[PDB]
Design a protein around this ligand. Sequence first.
Ligand SMILES: [Zn+2]
Length: 49
Amino acid sequence: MILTCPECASRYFVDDSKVGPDGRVVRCASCGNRWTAFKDEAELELVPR
Ligand SMILES: [Zn+2]
C-alpha cells in the first residue's frame, strides 16, 4: 500500500500488514510527520483475499 504526506505532498510505500480496517498510525520518512492511515486494498465485501 502507499500513503501521501500532508507536508511532503509525496507518496511513500509500506507493507499491507502495517495497516488494518480499524486503521493505524504512520510516520513520514521525509519530515517525521504522523497521521492515521486506513486500508482500502481489501475493505470491499466478498473480496477474494
Ligand atoms: Zn513528510
